[PDB]
Structures are given as C-alpha cells and as structure tokens.
RNA sequence: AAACUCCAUAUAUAUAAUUUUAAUUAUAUAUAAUUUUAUAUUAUUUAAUAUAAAGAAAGGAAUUAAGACAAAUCAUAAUGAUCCUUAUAAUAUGGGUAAUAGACGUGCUAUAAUAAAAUGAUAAUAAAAUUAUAUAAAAUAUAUUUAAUUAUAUUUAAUUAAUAAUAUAAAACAUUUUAAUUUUUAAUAUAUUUUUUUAUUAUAAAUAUGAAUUAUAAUCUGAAAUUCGAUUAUAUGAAA
C-alpha cells in the first residue's frame, strides 16, 4: 500500500456521499445492523395458514337450500349420546 | 495416632540461676489510618508500618466524625442516584 | 542400494525376494476335530514375496536412521551382499516343511 | 448482556424501598447482574422451589444472583 | 381471563388445531404486530452515541416485554400434525407426516430419492 | 424372483446467437448388452476353462413376498374402551430434562519421524448443494510493527442465481523444523562431501508429544448465557 491512507479515506467518504451508504472511518458500533435487518414478521405470522378459510358452518350461510351433513361432527354427537345413555357422560361443570 | 514431638532429657535450671525471658524486640513505628504515629515494641523486624484499616477510620470508634473495583473499571464508559431512580420500580416484588 | 553396490537395484531386489521367499508353508488345520495335523502348502508368487517383504521390513526397523527409506535401503544392500535373520527364518520354515513329508494329501 | 459494551444485565426491582427500610427483595430473576447500587441489601433469590435469603457483599458485585441460589441438591449414593 | 387463553383475541389457524399450535400461532402474531417496535428498542439500547439514560430505559422496556413479543420463542411446528421435531421448513411438516404426504403425492413434486 | 424403473456410462439427434458458457458443458428424445462370435481342451447335441476379435461396455440405488415375533409406536396423527372435568383441562415466572458411586454401549482426540508442525498470490487439482424467515464479497480497524495468517468489529458490493456469494478445496508435491538421540549444538582449526566433512574441547521414561482440567480478559447470538451455549487471547499442560 504505497498509495496514501488519507486520500483513500477521502475517496471512500466521497463514494459513500454519492450512494446512500454511510461512512464510518473510526469503526465504532453504530447500531446499523439492528435497523437495517429486513423485518420477517408477516412471513412468520403466515405459517399455519389463512384463518379465513371456508368451514362447514358457512359448507349453511351461502347455500341454505342444500341440507349438508358434517360427518365427523355427527359421529361425535352420536358418541356423546351413547355415553349419556350408558352412564359415562361428562360430569356437570362447576361454576362457583 | 497422636502426632507428637518426643521430649529429650530436660536441662536442669538450678535454683537462683533461672533467668527471665527477655525476647529480642525492636521499636516499631505504627502510622495509623490518619498521620498519627505511635511507637510500640515488637518482635518482628520492621521499623515502620503504616495501617489502612484502624480505629481512627472505623465508624464505630468515631461516630461524630476487588470485585466492585473491577466492575467500575469495565463499566466506566457508561458511568452506571439517577440510575437507581431509573431502574427501581417497586410494584413487582 | 544402487549407490552402495553399483548394479541394477530392481533385479537385485527380485533376486533377494526369490532367495528369501519360502517355496512352501506348513499351514495348520483343524483336521476333523482331532490333532491339528499341519500340511506343507505351495505358495503363490505374491505370497512368497509377501512373506519375504515383512521380514525385510522387520530387519530394516532394527537399523538406526529416522527415515524408514534409508533403513530399508541398508537392509536391501545387506541382503544383496548376503546377511540376514530372514534367511535363517526361511531355512527353519523349510526344515519344518521337510518334517511332514507325506502329510500332503494328493501327493 | 455479557459483552462489556452493552452491559450490564439490568432488571427492574423494588430497590429504593429496600434501601429506605430493610425489606428483602424476592427476586425470581436469577440472570440480573449484581450492581454496586445494591451491596448490603437483602435478596431472596429463587431456587426453582424455595426463595433463598442472601446479603450481597462487595465480592458479589460482578456476578449474577442465580449463581448464589444452587438449584440442584448435593448428590449422594445409597450404598446398598 | 376466562373467555380466552391469551390477552389478545387471535383467530384459530385452519385445519389441524392443537393447544401447542394455538400457543405458537398467537406468539407469532404478537411478534408480527410488535416487530418494528422491538427492533427500535434494541437499536436504542445498543448505542454508544446516544444518551446512556435513554439506552437504559430502552433496555428496561425490552426486558419488561412479554413472552409473546419474543422472536426467539417462536418454534416451527408441523402444520398437518402438531409435532415439533424434525420439522422441515420447505413443507411445514414433521418427518413422518412429510413422508406420508410425499408418498401420497400431496407435495406435488417430491418423490422417492432413488439416485 | 427376473425384467421394465432411477443414477452412472457409450453413441446419435435436437437446443444454447459460445457474455447466465462450463460446448472439456446442460437436458430432452432415442439406440446400446441379462453381451456376441470362433478355435482348442476336458466331460457328456451341449457346458466349464483357455485362447483369440468385436465392442465404451464395468457398477450402484430403489424394490425386501406370505407368514410369523400378541417385535416397536396410543409421544407424528387418528380411533375403541376406560378414567379426569375448579382438574389428569388452560396461562405466566423460575427450576429441571445437562444431577453423579460403580457399570454398559456408540463415537472424538490422542499416545511423534514408513509422521507431526511453519511456509507455498501470475493463488496445483474437485464435486455436490444452499442463499426473500437471506448468502454476505471487497476494503478499513483492533488482537499484532511491518504484512500474511487466524479471530472479531466496521459496512454491505453483487445475486435471490448456469449470471454474484457461501468458497483461492484439502491431502498431494517442495523446502524448513522436529525431543527422546553426545544419532545434536559451538569454539577452534580442517578441506576436491562446504545448506557439508574430519580432528579436539565443552555440550549430563511424557517432549519443542498430547490437549484434559482450571484462572483471568475479551468477542458472538439473543430481551436473557447463573444453573446451561459458541468463539478468540494470555496462562494452566491430567491421563495416555
Ligand atoms: Mg426385481
Ligand atoms: Mg465453452
Ligand atoms: Mg413378508
Ligand atoms: Mg406386545
Ligand atoms: Mg405387536
Ligand atoms: Mg387412544
Ligand atoms: Mg392426541
Ligand atoms: Mg392443565
Ligand atoms: Mg437425553
Ligand atoms: Mg447407531
Ligand atoms: Mg505427531
Ligand atoms: Mg473480506
Ligand atoms: Mg459465482
Ligand atoms: Mg490454495
Ligand atoms: Mg504417563
Ligand atoms: Mg501441543
Ligand atoms: Mg495436534
């Protein structure tokens, strides 16, 4: 490095001025890497899916004419009924 | 089992010939916490001692009148009262 | 080796191998759960020269230098000139093979 | 914050009230750095199970509070 | 409180719901909500140039932020099941569950690794 | 079962304005072999050996049937029966899963000279794969009087990719050094072995192996590193 240091520094400063990028000659912790990091929140939030998705409830709202049957729900209800019948139903919940 | 130094035959001190134990003692100057010097006779060879923690700088003896150091050294730029007031919310306990 | 004795080194090594390599070995057997009756068995060329090489290596390892290559070369020169315990071992093997003459099966 | 720059690890505590009147500070922090501003304050640092009473000396100034509340019991073997 | 597990009323994710999944999802939502703020606080804290009192205050604020603001707290669950081990990011699925889906043909292209 | 299949191989055709170039390539589509032919030598028209001439022609992967082991899994998930419903359901703060007498597997690093360490910029030679929940180049600063190396910080050039980055591959090979080793050194002479020789003097079981264990200081990630994380430096230098 026969070329002088001060001149190189000046050149670097000029380049920094030209572009938006900052010029930190001292090499101090400015905190630039904290803010400059792209925020990843929306992608993280979108992990499990789109919460507004069509459900069986809606398939009654959209098409009242068609008497649909949710099979799993019906099965569950039948199981509950069977439990009630044979004395294995859920105990009544405490309120206090 | 019992650790001992086994005795030799004792030397007969004759009656009248017994001499008093005058131990070798130096006059030693003790400078206390403040500049008050006091002379005391002492068996250890040191003409001068200066003391750091004495009665003359202890609060009990005058009511009317290095981990911490390391911490101070390496948290000096921050300067760590105002700081106490800032970091002392007494709701949670 | 060549430097020590100025004549083709590879040829000399081959000769040494031929000399040293025991032509047969008294291979042990279980022998149908009985006495372990040993038999002389003829050797492949590689096996013959393999036996020789291990002995040569061992005899080299008794020499002084740090570098193994030097030690090896000294040993090869000694063998060319005609001195080793490897030769004695070969002779012993041959003697042991000679005992058990008709233990060979096909004959 | 371990690194000398950005330290120490500061936590909110009922410090000033303890300083005024000797009421021990029940910490469940265990990762708060001890400071010079609380030497001679009584702390009751959590141990997982039970809060542990400690009077912070001047030798403790650099350390964490959890370092003085040992969580596991001292191991032994039942020689059977 | 009684009507909800967490402070804020968040929606349930579609398909496979689980308690752990619910917990994670809410946490992720709160992180998304309070991402910029947290970043700003962090910046204020880790500043040699700024006033020290301000940086201390920022640090205290960061410390006092809840469990659900923390980015580090987020853990990638399986979406089809609710497992949290060997969860591949390219199809948000657990190891066994991914394999099951792959062999069926749910991940469009994935296929047997024959070489 | 074999075969079709995939990878890899050989050949052909197509495409790529040979700056996204690596055409010595990539990728679609074919063809190719579970190779063929002939002379002989043994055993009975064939089958093994050998020889020859024709060919690029030589592997790996996936596929592991029926039954069985009441083999493993109700902790991927789901469901039967059964039990809990102010609790065996739900949330927070900390602790634990990392505890340590002996024991048992798997590994890693070692115990030095057919083997370890310094160095090697017209930068000796690869492949496969990753980079919008990023990859981070050059360069400056400190550790460190030059600088390089290694490690951090400073700050983001380029590219979301046959285009840029991760990334000058490493052993190799070459010079140098290497205690145990008076199998070396350094003072004299010595000389047609001179990075060396000879003579005479003095040079008197763990190292210039190993890297466990610990002390202090820094750095990294994170809101947080005490229990309980990862680096770097200066010391520490067990066992073997
Ligand atoms: Mg098959
Ligand atoms: Mg080309
Ligand atoms: Mg089967
Ligand atoms: Mg069973
Ligand atoms: Mg079974
Ligand atoms: Mg079940
Ligand atoms: Mg379940
Ligand atoms: Mg519960
Ligand atoms: Mg475990
Ligand atoms: Mg295993
Ligand atoms: Mg070594
Ligand atoms: Mg660079
Ligand atoms: Mg490139
Ligand atoms: Mg290189
Ligand atoms: Mg030893
Ligand atoms: Mg070492
Ligand atoms: Mg080493």
Swiss-Prot record, chain B:
The keyword Ribonucleoprotein applies. GO terms for molecular function: structural constituent of ribosome. GO terms for biological process: mitochondrial translation. Residues 17-80 are annotated as: Sufficient for general mitochondrial translation. One of its GO terms (cellular component) is mitochondrial large ribosomal subunit. The keyword Transferase does not apply. It is found in: Mitochondrion. Its main location: mitochondrion. Disulfide bonds: none annotated. Keywords: Mitochondrion, Ribonucleoprotein, Ribosomal protein, Transit peptide. Component of the mitochondrial large ribosomal subunit (mt-LSU). Mature yeast 74S mitochondrial ribosomes consist of a small (37S) and a large (54S) subunit. The 37S small subunit contains a 15S ribosomal RNA (15S mt-rRNA) and 34 different proteins. The 54S large subunit contains a 21S rRNA (21S mt-rRNA) and 46 different proteins. Contains two functional domains. The central domain is sufficient for general mitochondrial translation but not suppression of COX2 mutants. The C-terminus sequence is sufficient for dosage suppression of COX2 mutants. Belongs to the bacterial ribosomal protein bL31 family. Highly divergent. This is Large ribosomal subunit protein bL31m. The gene is MRPL36. The chain holds residues 20 to 134 of 177 of the full protein.
From Swiss-Prot, chain C:
It is found in: Mitochondrion. It comes from the Eukaryota. Component of the mitochondrial ribosome (mitoribosome), a dedicated translation machinery responsible for the synthesis of mitochondrial genome-encoded proteins, including at least some of the essential transmembrane subunits of the mitochondrial respiratory chain. The mitoribosomes are attached to the mitochondrial inner membrane and translation products are cotranslationally integrated into the membrane. Belongs to the universal ribosomal protein uS7 family. Present with 1340 molecules/cell in log phase SD medium. Component of the mitochondrial small ribosomal subunit (mt-SSU). Mature yeast 74S mitochondrial ribosomes consist of a small (37S) and a large (54S) subunit. The 37S small subunit contains a 15S ribosomal RNA (15S mt-rRNA) and 34 different proteins. The 54S large subunit contains a 21S rRNA (21S mt-rRNA) and 46 different proteins. This is Small ribosomal subunit protein uS7m. It comes from Saccharomyces cerevisiae (strain ATCC 204508 / S288c) (Baker's yeast). The chain holds residues 141 to 247 of 247 of the full protein.
UniProtKB/Swiss-Prot annotation, chain D:
The keyword Kinase does not apply. Component of the mitochondrial small ribosomal subunit (mt-SSU). Mature yeast 74S mitochondrial ribosomes consist of a small (37S) and a large (54S) subunit. The 37S small subunit contains a 15S ribosomal RNA (15S mt-rRNA) and 34 different proteins. The 54S large subunit contains a 21S rRNA (21S mt-rRNA) and 46 different proteins. Keywords: Mitochondrion, Ribonucleoprotein, Ribosomal protein. The gene is RSM19. InterPro entries: Ribosomal_uS19, Ribosomal_uS19_CS, Ribosomal_uS19_SF. Belongs to the universal ribosomal protein uS19 family. GO terms for cellular component: mitochondrial inner membrane; mitochondrial small ribosomal subunit; mitochondrion. One of its GO terms (molecular function) is structural constituent of ribosome. The keyword Ribosomal protein applies. It is found in: Mitochondrion. Component of the mitochondrial ribosome (mitoribosome), a dedicated translation machinery responsible for the synthesis of mitochondrial genome-encoded proteins, including at least some of the essential transmembrane subunits of the mitochondrial respiratory chain. The mitoribosomes are attached to the mitochondrial inner membrane and translation products are cotranslationally integrated into the membrane. This is Small ribosomal subunit protein uS19m. It comes from the Eukaryota. GO terms for biological process: mitochondrial translation; ribosomal small subunit assembly.
From Swiss-Prot, chain E:
Disulfide bonds: none annotated. Keywords: Mitochondrion, Ribonucleoprotein, Ribosomal protein. One of its GO terms (molecular function) is structural constituent of ribosome. GO terms for biological process: mitochondrial translation; translation. Its main location: mitochondrion. Signal peptide: none annotated. It holds the Pfam family Ribosomal_S14. It is found in: Mitochondrion. One of its GO terms (cellular component) is mitochondrial small ribosomal subunit. InterPro entries: Ribosomal_uS14 (IPR001209), Ribosomal_uS14_CS (IPR018271). Component of the mitochondrial ribosome (mitoribosome), a dedicated translation machinery responsible for the synthesis of mitochondrial genome-encoded proteins, including at least some of the essential transmembrane subunits of the mitochondrial respiratory chain. The mitoribosomes are attached to the mitochondrial inner membrane and translation products are cotranslationally integrated into the membrane. PANTHER family: 30S RIBOSOMAL PROTEIN S14 (PTHR19836), SMALL RIBOSOMAL SUBUNIT PROTEIN US14M (PTHR19836:SF19). Component of the mitochondrial small ribosomal subunit (mt-SSU). Mature yeast 74S mitochondrial ribosomes consist of a small (37S) and a large (54S) subunit. The 37S small subunit contains a 15S ribosomal RNA (15S mt-rRNA) and 34 different proteins. The 54S large subunit contains a 21S rRNA (21S mt-rRNA) and 46 different proteins. Belongs to the universal ribosomal protein uS14 family. This is Small ribosomal subunit protein uS14m. It comes from Saccharomyces cerevisiae (strain ATCC 204508 / S288c).
